[PDB]
């Protein structure tokens, strides 16, 4: 879908006693399972996408809250952006005492009707003003025949859920270990888009996974001036960009209210609230003072207008991988401007890969920025993983240093090791061989930070303290490697350290 549309998601639990207070074991509880799910996807969505909408609803309860079509349904929460007080409302109903806390309020086991329940949720999504990209309902019921004993009750539901799917709201399901069996082919076969224990999907809602997730958006758009005249529009996209702990919002102590940092500039002698025109900019050199205006400290540092000018072609081997400037950015075509320029770009991509070549360019991302120099290395897609595109096809902008960047480094000379000293090393290295994958690690600080932040947010008992994956697991490095550190200590240097 288009950029702005929120994900929006409504959670809809069976309040019926026959599942709600029920267990075959003692070790879980289907309502305590669903409520855990709702709290846990919701705490995922809080860290990861505060912009996307959640609601939660109980059907078949005995005391009601709805706009209309009231009987035996209670909207615990209408659609809203997610936060702490909503997670505290769900927390109240959890656990062995929780399954009594709920009973003092909304009441349990009464008759219900899916064609009314699906009506209610529909009205909910309608009532909200925002643009929605995905509209999804989640069923937390075990009741595999949903009391369609009256087939002329049940045909209402099936038609109404035809009407859900027809209006482009989706609906989705989880089965919840009903004693002895559950089978979708009896009923729910036509409500969703051979026999089950409990859903292999449901564990994915307990991943508790944390990052920002920020959708595909351009960094900027530019014209690749091949010369004085021929241009194509290309996008500039950010495939790799270091995340930061979110900017902290300064607060008033006594009320927790936000407060305005309200900076001014004041003459050291006198009451002049000096305006931006009152003051210049300056330097000191050679015991004299150089004076420039607030226009020209940024008229200096201009050279060009926003574009990419072609500088001719190179071998890919001469672009030496030791000197690297800043993270590489992707280039991909954009018919939003310069229509049909995709036809040129695609031929340019295809044929550079045959030539074993890069294009060299001068790059300005904005007006009032100096040109850097950038090699456009061409790119090719590994769809072989059943069209999981690990690599999009296009170009990489790889940046190149200038003289000033390549800092001087001290004198040293040696070519010291013998073939035995390499030969022992060639063993330890081959014993320590694993497979790195790009996603195999996580930031120890930024992951810890969210766990501290949750403890403070919910008033939990404890910070979760989940230990990081960057420390070497040194006992495994002792054992897999084995004792071979002694080959350095014996064969390579004296015993004095």
């Amino acid at each position: 879908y288009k950029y702005s549309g929120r994900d929006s998601l409504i959670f809809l639990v069976d309040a019926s006693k026959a599942m709600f207070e029920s267990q075959s074991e003692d070790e879980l509880t289907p309502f305590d399972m669903s409520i855990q799910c709702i709290q846990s996807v919701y705490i995922s969505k809080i860290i990861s996408s505060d912009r996307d909408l959640l609601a939660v609803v109980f059907y078949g309860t005995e005391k009601d809250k709805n706009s209309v079509n009231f009987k035996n349904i209670y909207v615990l929460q209408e659609l809203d952006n997610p936060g702490a007080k909503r997670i505290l409302e769900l927390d109240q109903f959890k656990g062995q005492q929780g399954q009594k806390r709920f009973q003092d309020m909304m009441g349990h086991g009464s008759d219900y009707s899916l064609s009314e329940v699906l009506w209610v949720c529909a009205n909910l999504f309608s009532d909200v003003q925002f643009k929605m990209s995905h509209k999804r309902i989640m069923l937390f019921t075990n009741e595999d025949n949903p009391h369609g004993n009256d087939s002329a009750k049940a045909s209402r539901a099936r038609t109404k859920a035809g009407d859900l799917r027809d209006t482009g709201i989706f609906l989705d399901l989880m089965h919840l270990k009903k004693p002895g069996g559950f089978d979708i082919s009896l009923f729910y076969r036509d409500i969703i888009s051979v026999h089950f224990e409990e859903s292999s999907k449901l564990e994915d809602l307990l991943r508790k996974v944390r990052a920002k997730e920020t959708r595909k958006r351009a960094l900027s758009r530019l014209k690749l001036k091949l010369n004085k005249d021929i241009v194509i529009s290309v996008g500039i996209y950010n495939l790799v960009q270091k995340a930061l702990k979110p900017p902290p919002i300064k607060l008033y102590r006594e009320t927790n209210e936000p407060v305005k940092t309200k900076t001014r500039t004041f003459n050291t002698s006198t009451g002049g609230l000096l305006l931006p025109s009152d003051t210049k900019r300056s330097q000191i050199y050679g015991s004299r003072q150089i004076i420039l205006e607030k226009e020209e400290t940024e008229e200096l540092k201009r050279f060009d207008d926003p574009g990419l000018m072609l500088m001719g072609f190179k071998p890919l081997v001469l672009l030496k991988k030791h000197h690297y400037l800043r993270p590489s950015l992707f280039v991909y075509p954009e018919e939003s401007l310069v229509i049909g320029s995709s036809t040129l770009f695609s031929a340019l991509l295809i044929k550079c890969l045959e030539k074993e070549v890069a294009a060299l360019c001068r790059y300005t991302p904005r007006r009032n920025i100096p040109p850097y120099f950038v090699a456009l290395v061409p790119q090719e897609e590994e769809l072989d993983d059943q069209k999981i595109q690990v690599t999009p096809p296009g170009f990489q902008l790889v940046f190149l240093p200038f003289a000033d960047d390549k800092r001087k480094m001290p004198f040293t000379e040696k070519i010291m090791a013998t073939p035995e000293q390499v030969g022992k090393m060639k063993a330890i290295v081959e014993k320590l061989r694993f497979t790195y994958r790009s996603d195999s690690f996580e930031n120890p600080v930024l992951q810890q930070h969210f766990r501290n932040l949750e403890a403070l947010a919910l008033d939990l008992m404890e910070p979760e303290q989940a230990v990081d994956l960057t420390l070497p697991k040194v006992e495994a490095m002792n054992k897999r490697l084995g004792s071979l550190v002694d080959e350095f200590k014996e064969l390579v240097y004296p015993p004095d350290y």
Binding site: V41, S48, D172, D204, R207, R215, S440, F441, L469, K473
Partner: peptide, 23 residues
């Protein structure tokens, strides 16, 4: 379609479970 797309956060690709060094 389903195979790579997360149920917690749709359209976005499924976050695999952190890994690390393991020989």
């Amino acid at each position: 379609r389903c195979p790579g797309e997360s149920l917690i956060n749709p359209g976005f690709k499924s976050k695999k479970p952190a890994g690390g060094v393991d020989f």
